[PDB]
Structures are given as structure tokens and as C-alpha cells.
Amino acid sequence: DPTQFEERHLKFLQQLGKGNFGSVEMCRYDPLQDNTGEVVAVKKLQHSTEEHLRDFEREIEILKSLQHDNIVKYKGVCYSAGRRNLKLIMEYLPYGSLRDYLQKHKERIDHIKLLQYTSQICKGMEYLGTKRYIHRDLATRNILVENENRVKIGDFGLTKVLPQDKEYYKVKEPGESPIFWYAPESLTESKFSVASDVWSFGVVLYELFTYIEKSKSPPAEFMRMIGNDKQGQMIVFHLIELLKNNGRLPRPDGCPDEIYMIMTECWNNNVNQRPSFRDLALRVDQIRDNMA
Numbered sequence: 001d002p003t004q005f006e007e008r009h010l011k012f013l014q015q016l017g018k019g020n021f022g023s024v025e026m027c028r029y030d031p032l033q034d035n036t037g038e039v040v041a042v043k044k045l046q047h048s049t050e051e052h053l054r055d056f057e058r059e060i061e062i063l064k065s066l067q068h069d070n071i072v073k074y075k076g077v078c079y080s081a082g083r084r085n086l087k088l089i090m091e092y093l094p095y096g097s098l099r100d101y102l103q104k105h106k107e108r109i110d111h112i113k114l115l116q117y118t119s120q121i122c123k124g125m126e127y128l129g130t131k132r133y134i135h136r137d138l139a140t141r142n143i144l145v146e147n148e149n150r151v152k153i154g155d156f157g158l159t160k161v162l163p164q165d166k167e168y169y170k171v172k173e174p175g176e177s178p179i180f181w182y183a184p185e186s187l188t189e190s191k192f193s194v195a196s197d198v199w200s201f202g203v204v205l206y207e208l209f210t211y212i213e214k215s216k217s218p219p220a221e222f223m224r225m226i227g228n229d230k231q232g233q234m235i236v237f238h239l240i241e242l243l244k245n246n247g248r249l250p251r252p253d254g255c256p257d258e259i260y261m262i263m264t265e266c267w268n269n270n271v272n273q274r275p276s277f278r279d280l281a282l283r284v285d286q287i288r289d290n291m292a
């Protein structure tokens with residue numbers, strides 16, 4: 001069974017970053033101990049408590065159930081003897097996160113390339129929604145670059161399955177929340193749906209067309225709009241009030257009008273009025289086609 005990975009054969013190579021409750025490391029799976037084994041990405045929990053272990057195991061099952069070109073590939077799991085610590089083994093994508101990639105190359109990644117990525121992100125999200133999963137954490141830091149032509153959604157640490165008879169998931173005790181990517185109803189009511197994922201996708205699109213410029217980041221811009229003096233819980237209060245009054249991120253400099261229109265449609269206060277991922281993928285592909 002190639003999906004069974006023995007821990008003692010995993011050699012640390014380097015850190016790939018922190019993903020909320022876990023950390024990711026590039027490791028070589030080297031059972032021959034001759035440095036010829038496959039390089040893989042290993043996700044593990046920083047604090048592997050009961051509750052966290054339970055959530056991590058659901059995360060692993062979620063990822064194992066997804067097979068798509070634009071979703072990072074599940075490879076297997078590590079089990080520890082005794083207390084049953086879990087490690088998630090995934091394919092290694094060597095160009096790193098889209099956030100770092102775009103921050104590095106900036107405008108050398110042209111609009112044609114940005115829209116190819118948008119389309120791939122859209123397709124990965126559409127497929128996710130057909131499984132009734134809600135991502136809840138869609139941001140360029142959670143998207144990975146395989147090569148110049150392909151990106152994949154790379155982390156599913158906050159992903160939840162919808163109840164059979166509901167079209168939203170409600171979070172009763174929120175943890176660390178990426179509030180600057182949140183839809184209004186997620187801020188006010190902790191309600192998460194395909195439509196709040198679409199809102200966050202609008203924010204991802206904004207990130208892409210600002211080329212991850214620090215002064216233009218969603219946190220920087222929303223803080224500017226509510227006032228940099230706002231702190232802690234008051235940030236959430238003022239953000240809710242800003243969004244209610246149609247305060248929005250500005251059009252990135254140089255952004256095509258058709259692309260900006262997509263963002264603004266995703267950021268609808270009316271949940272039902274937001275576009276679908278199926279339609280967004282059709283629209284982006286048409287725009288790419290017009291440009292080519």
C-alpha cells in the first residue's frame with residue numbers, strides 16, 4: 001500500500017509554511033536511505049489535541065475525496081504508535097504558493113496568465129461545491145503553483161461539509177478568522193456557503209490583479225477604509241458597517257473593466273445575487289478567448 005507512509009523514512013528538507021492549525025514541510029520519502037526517494041509535502045498539527053486531531057482527520061478525508069486538476073493531490077497518511085498522531089502526505093508543487101510566486105514575478109505575469117489562474121481556481125472551487133464542501137479560506141496563500149501553466153487549491157484546513165438539508169454551515173465558536181476575505185453574513189452570523197466562497201473568490205481576484213502589493217492588500221485597504229485606529233473586535237464592527245454601506249476594495253490599477261465587474265458582482269450584499277462558480281468559469285474562459 002503506497003498510501004501508507006512510515007515516518008522514520010521521511011527526511012526533512014525544508015519548511016513550506018504554516019496553514020492555520022498545521023505546518024507543512026517538504027520531505028523526501030526515502031525508505032532506501034540513499035536520497036533517491038520521492039519529494040513530498042507533509043502536513044502535521046502544531047498542537048495535536050483531541051479536538052484538533054478530530055478536525056485534522058476530517059480534513060484528510062475531505063482531501064482524499066477530491067480528484068481534480070486544480071486541487072492538490074492526496075498521497076497518503078502517517079500514523080504514530082500510541083496516541084495516534086496524523087500526518088497528511090501530499091504531492092509537492094515546486095513553484096510554491098501563488099501569493100509568493102506573484103509577489104516575486106509581479107507584472108511579468110501578464111493578464112493572460114492571471115486569467116488562466118483565475119479559471120483554474122474557479123474550476124477547482126466549482127468541483128469542490130459539487131461535493132457540498134465549503135472552503136471558508138480561499139486566498140492566494142492557499143493556492144499553489146505546479147508550473148507556469150497550472151495552479152491548484154492547496155489547503156483545506158477550514159473546509160466544512162454542508163448538512164444534508166442546509167445550504168449554509170454555521171460556526172458556533174469561531175477561531176482565527178480571515179475576516180478581510182469574509183462575506184458580510186459570515187461576519188455577522190458566522191454563516192458559510194458556496195456564496196460566501198464566491199465572495200472570497202472576488203477577493204482572490206483582487207489579490208491577483210494587485211500583484212500582492214503590500215499597501216494594496218485587502219487587510220491594508222479595509223483598515224484604511226475603517227480607520228487604522230480600529231483595534232480587535234472593533235475592526236469587525238466597523239468592517240460590518242463598511243460593507244453594509246457598500247464600502248468595497250477599489251479597482252486595482254490597470255485592471256480590465258470586465259475583470260473588475262466580476263469582482264464587484266462577487267461582492268454582493270445579496271447572497272443569492274452572487275454569480276455561480278459554473279458561470280464564473282464560463283465568463284473567465286470567454287474573456288481569455290476574446291484576448292486570444
Ligand SMILES: Nc1n[nH]c2ccc(-c3ccccc3)cc12
Pocket residue numbers: 016017018019024041072090091092093094096097141142144154155
Ligand atoms: N509546495 C507545496 N506542495 N504541496 C503543498 C501542500 C501544502 C502547502 C501549504 C499549504 C498551506 C500553508 C503552507 C503550505 C504547500 C505545498
